[PDB]
């Protein structure tokens, strides 16, 4: 009985492979052959924000391109000001172990989550001038790995028990549960039109979900190990993935298959974070080799290096208007490159 | 070229910095430990005199020294992802059960995986061997045999140089020394020397267990101090 099921599954998989192969006539590299290179770039650190006393685990640029929030291991979540390197708020957390934070699009909420399996929401703008906890969303069975705001009243969470959830803040209970993965879910990314998001887990497979129904639409497998970060192209029809094999990959949704890869021989370490530029011509990256790289999005030619840290880089971010790039690391310092 | 509001904001930032300095300085006085045991090992009954599904915490103080011990019971069988956080702790505590002979190889494989990890090449490990009285009762019973599971126990070298406990059945000493040497062999096979292991023996009802941890954390810190003064 079950063997017949496995047989039809294998036949359908082979048919899918043939169907996805049939559409590949000419690759991306042979098309972009005649393009003037972007030349060479070099950026110098413009600022340095100090004040943390432990490792930094996450950050998130504000929507007004001036404010940002950072989360540390010592248990404090603090908000900075980029231009005048001041401090606006410092929030003491209940649990010291914190691995993810998110900053609301409206500008008056923040979210926090870690090993305690609870996502906590803090409200910023209120009377009496202190930050107080609004909600403590619980219902997961593994460590929270990522969280993102959809609207002012909706949040999506990716946990470490092979599942993702969509919540309603006021009600305080889940309304949709995405469960297709088989390994730990590590990364999550939304889309500009706010209708579908992508997820990446430890079983070396990325998935394209839908926010309304709750059904998987496409799955992509092209990696040899677990993936640690994911980004999404500004156009809305492509994305880039990074694993700990020192190989980044670019995938297209409509073609349903891989397009191009970025890799080299001198680098054999893992990748911790990726991000695209405003026009999409460049691709940032963060390695365990105590530095960062800059890849061309069309040619896979290393066109710059940013090295100012002594420990590994944990978080990377690009401003909405494309003016600066912020990088944090494990030496309690995060820097701004322009 | 600076308004009054900017000056007030700068004063606010300086006050926040002062508070952060004080709070961070206060926290360093305590020491940190990670307790992890496979199963059927009684890791809960290690220190009982002195004493949130994802994280469990236990605080105990000896000689004014404060120790925070973290035990995690809400995670899965695979622990390769949430262990990167614990790379700044003082020492890891490992607890096994030597009474049961069916699951010793699993414990050895777990210890080998932990010892040869990538983010734990500077963290030394304290090892405990729990439930020794059951071991004694089982070995004097004469039903279970070690040659069936471990073929090298049949031909063994007498531990004459080592000092056995004063007054004891030689068979018990032979078996327990073989078991301990089994773990110490895995400990020393790499032979790197960056970190070392401290084996111990523990009974079911023992009142003193914080003293052993204290006089081992002291040795760990002494080794670090000897290393960073260029004396070694």
């Amino acid at each position, epitope marked *: 009985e079950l063997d017949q099921l496995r047989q039809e599954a294998e036949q359908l998989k082979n048919q899918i492979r043939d169907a996805r192969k049939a559409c590949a006539d000419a690759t991306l590299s042979q098309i972009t052959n005649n393009i003037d290179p972007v030349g060479r770039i070099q950026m110098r650190t413009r600022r340095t924000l100090r004040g943390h006393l432990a490792k930094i685990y996450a950050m998130h640029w504000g929507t007004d391109s001036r404010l940002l929030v950072s989360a540390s291991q010592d248990g404090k979540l603090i908000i900075w000001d980029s231009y005048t390197t001041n401090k606006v708020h410092a929030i003491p957390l209940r649990s010291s172990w914190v691995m993810t934070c998110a900053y609301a699009p409206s500008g008056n909420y923040v979210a926090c989550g870690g090993l305690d399996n609870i996502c906590s929401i803090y409200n910023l703008k209120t009377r009496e001038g202190n930050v107080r906890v609004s909600r403590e969303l619980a219902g997961h069975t593994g460590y929270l790995s990522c969280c993102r705001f959809l609207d002012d009243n909706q949040i999506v969470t990716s946990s470490g028990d092979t599942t993702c959830a969509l919540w309603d803040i006021e009600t305080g209970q889940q309304t949709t549960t995405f469960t297709g993965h088989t390994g730990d879910v590590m990364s999550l990314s939304l889309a500009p039109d706010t209708r579908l998001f992508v997820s990446g887990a430890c079983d070396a497979s990325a998935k394209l979900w839908d926010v309304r129904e709750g059904m998987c639409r496409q799955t992509f497998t092209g990696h040899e190990s677990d993936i640690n970060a994911i980004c999404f192209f500004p156009n809305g029809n492509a994305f880039a993935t990074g694993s700990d094999d020192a190989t980044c990959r670019l995938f297209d949704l409509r073609a349903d298959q891989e397009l191009m890869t970025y890799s080299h021989d001198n680098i054999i370490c893992g990748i911790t974070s990726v991000s695209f530029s405003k026009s999409g011509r460049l691709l940032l990256a963060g390695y365990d080799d105590f530095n960062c790289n800059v890849w061309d999005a069309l040619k896979a030619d290393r066109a710059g290096v940013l090295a100012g840290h002594d420990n590994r880089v944990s978080c990377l971010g690009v401003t909405d208007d494309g003016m600066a790039v912020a990088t944090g690391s494990w030496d309690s310092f995060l820097k701004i490159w322009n | 070229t600076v308004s009054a509001e900017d000056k007030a904001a700068a004063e*606010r930032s300086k006050m926040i910095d002062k508070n952060l300095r004080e709070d961070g300085e206060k926290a360093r006085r305590t020491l940190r430990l990670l307790l992890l045991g496979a199963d059927n090992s009684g890791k809960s009954t290690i220190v009982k005199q002195m004493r949130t599904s994802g994280i469990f915490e236990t605080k105990f103080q000896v000689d004014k020294v404060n120790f925070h011990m973290f035990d995690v019971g809400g995670q899965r069988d695979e622990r390769r992802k949430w262990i990167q956080c614990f790379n700044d702790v003082t020492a890891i505590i490992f607890v096994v059960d030597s009474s049961d002979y069916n699951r010793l190889q699993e414990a050895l494989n777990d210890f080998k995986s932990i010892w040869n990890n990538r983010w734990l090449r500077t963290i030394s490990v304290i090892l405990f061997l729990n439930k020794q009285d059951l071991l004694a009762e089982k070995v004097l019973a004469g039903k279970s045999k070690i040659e069936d599971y471990f073929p090298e126990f049949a031909r063994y070298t007498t531990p004459e140089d080592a000092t056995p406990e004063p007054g004891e059945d030689p068979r018990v000493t032979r078996a327990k020394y073989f078991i301990r040497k089994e773990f110490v062999d895995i400990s020393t096979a790499s032979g790197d020397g960056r970190h070392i292991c401290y084996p111990h023996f523990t009974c079911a009802v023992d009142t003193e267990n914080a003293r052993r941890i204290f006089n081992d954390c002291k040795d760990i810190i002494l080794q670090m101090n000897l290393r960073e003064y260029n004396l070694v």
Partner: single-chain antibody
Amino acid sequence: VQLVESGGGLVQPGGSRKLSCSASGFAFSSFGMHVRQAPEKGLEWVAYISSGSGTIYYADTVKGRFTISRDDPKNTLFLQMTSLRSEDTAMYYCVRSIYYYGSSPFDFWGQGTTLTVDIVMTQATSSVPVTPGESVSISCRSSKSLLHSNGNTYLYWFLQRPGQSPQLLIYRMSNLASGVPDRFSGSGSGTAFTLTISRLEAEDVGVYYCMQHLEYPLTFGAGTKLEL
């Protein structure tokens, strides 16, 4: 969030007095504190105490004989007055303010207690007859430019109802306060500022003031009275 005051009464010249302002309902140590009104004149600034008692300012008219202190665990502050004159009869208010990026200072005003014994800002209009259901506008002129290098124009609009304490309406010339209906609006350019009210109706008749906050001391306007 409430402020209460104790002190006052008839005082002979050459004496001394102490006024006490107590707060209840908010975090008192995070805020900075500040204002008197003559019987038939607009508001005038007096003195300022910072948070943590790290900065104190006094006005030139009141320099040398006035002291301000604060008790944080008790959540109170005191003003001690010595060597009074015959021109110091007024009513005194207790005001809070907090300064960071995007904040709204001067957002709350106390009741005020009566006691009986530089940038020049001018407001032209004194009394304007208005018809209900009609839009109105008010102007406020300035002597030197208030626009700063970074692009912020520091100017505040205050409304005072009859027999009440004033409340904030517009801060930094464009934004709106909390709980203020959207009918009010403000606009202008360098050294020219206007407040516009559309679909005007009842309960909005009072006295309006324009204040600058570019540098100390802080100078108010002459005021404007609305009549039916």
